[PDB]
Structures are given as structure tokens and as C-alpha cells.
Amino acid sequence: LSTNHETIDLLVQILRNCLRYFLPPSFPISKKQLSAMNSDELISFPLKEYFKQYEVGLQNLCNSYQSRADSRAKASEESLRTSERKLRETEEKLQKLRTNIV
Amino acid sequence: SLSTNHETIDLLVQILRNCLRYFLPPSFPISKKQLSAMNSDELISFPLKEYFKQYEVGLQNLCNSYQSRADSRAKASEESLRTSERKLRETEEKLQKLRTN
């Protein structure tokens, strides 16, 4: 009917562009494979997994941005553990010497 | 037939709705409700270029927030380390004063 087939091709092109744009980094279907998909193949596309792999990638992306800062903080806590420990030990020694200086 | 054609359009329109809804930037002037009802002509003339742009802005804002929450948590830990290292200095000093006394 042409008026029908024009819409289908137009919808297939747009849908290709989106699925390529948001392609998760690990997804087993490549941008080439996506660019090569027809209408029927798109209709049976696995969107729910597509979204899942996207969410994983987003988590990996966000975790990477805050990776250097968290590593610096973790180093500070371990140093904080030892410094707070020696602070206890010296305060004990300090309180003994005061009681034993009468 | 035009049925298998009209069915292909409906299924393709539904998939496209689901995609555009999932990634819809939070601020986009077109709502998830509007998207869910859009027909084929409405989707074909959808303003994707701004849609994609507003997504990148939102994505950037998200990562920048993750890095600022991370920086603030590191700064608070450093300052807690600073004061503890300070109190260790002051008490270690007092300890050495009494050691001579």
C-alpha cells in the first residue's frame, strides 16, 4: 500500500538508531547486527534483557566515576583505625603516669 | 495483507514506545503517558535529537553526583583522620613531658 510500507521502513530506521545509541557495552548483539535488522527481527528483539544489560553498564559506569575517591577514603579509614588505636594506648599510658605521680 | 502490515506497525510502535519510555529523560516535555499513546505518525516525527541530548545531560549530571558524593565522603574521612592524628600528637606530647617529670 506504500503508505503502509513507508511507515514500516521509517519505524525500522528510527528503532535501529535508538537500539544502537543505548547498546550496553557487553550486549551479545553488535551495532552492525543491529543495523542489519529487518522489521520481523526487531519485533522479536529481546528488549527486557537489553534493559538489564544497560542497567548493569550504568552501575559499572557510575561505580567507575566514584572509584578513585572511594579508594582514597578506604585508605584513610585504615589509617584512622591505627591512629585511633595508638591514641588509646598513649592515653592509657598517660592516665597511668598521672595516677602514679600521685 | 494490510492486516499483517497493520500488525507490524502496531508491534513496531509498541516496541518504540517501550524504548523511548525507558530512557525518557526526567525533564522531557513529552511525558511517559503521552509516549504510551503516541501513534506511528507521532513517533516518526518525534524530536529524537533533543531527546538524545537531554539524556546525555542527565547521564552527565548523574555521574557528577556519584563523584561528588564520593569526594565528600573522602573529605569527611580525611578530616576525621586529621583530628585523630592531632589528638595523638597532643597526647603523645603530654606523655613525653611527664616522662621527664
Q: Which three cell numbers stand for residue A56?
A: 548493569
Q: Which three cell numbers stand for residue B26?
A: 526526567
CA distance A89 to A49: 56
Residue in B2, B8, B77 nearest the CB of A80 = B77
Residue B40 and residue B66 in one domain:
no
Residue B13 and residue B39 in one domain:
yes
Q: At what angle do helices A47-65 and B48-100 cross, to 10 degrees?
A: 40
Burial class (CB in 10 A: 0-12, 13-18, 19+), B57: exposed
Is residue A83 within 8 angstroms of chain B, CB to CB? yes
Residue B56 phi, psi (nearest 5): -60, -40
User: Pick from A1, A11, A3: which is nearest to B17 by CA?
Assistant: A11
Question: What domain count does chain B have?
Answer: 2
Domain range for B98 is 48-101
Amino acid found at A82: T
Residue B59 and residue B34 in one domain:
no
Burial class (CB in 10 A: 0-12, 13-18, 19+), A83: buried
Q: Are B43 and B16 in contact (CB under 8 A)?
A: yes
CA distance A55 to A87: 45
Q: Are B50 and B21 in contact (CB under 8 A)?
A: no
Q: Residue A66 has what DSSP assignment? A: T
Q: Which residues of B touch A87 (CB under 8 A)?
A: 84, 87-88, 91
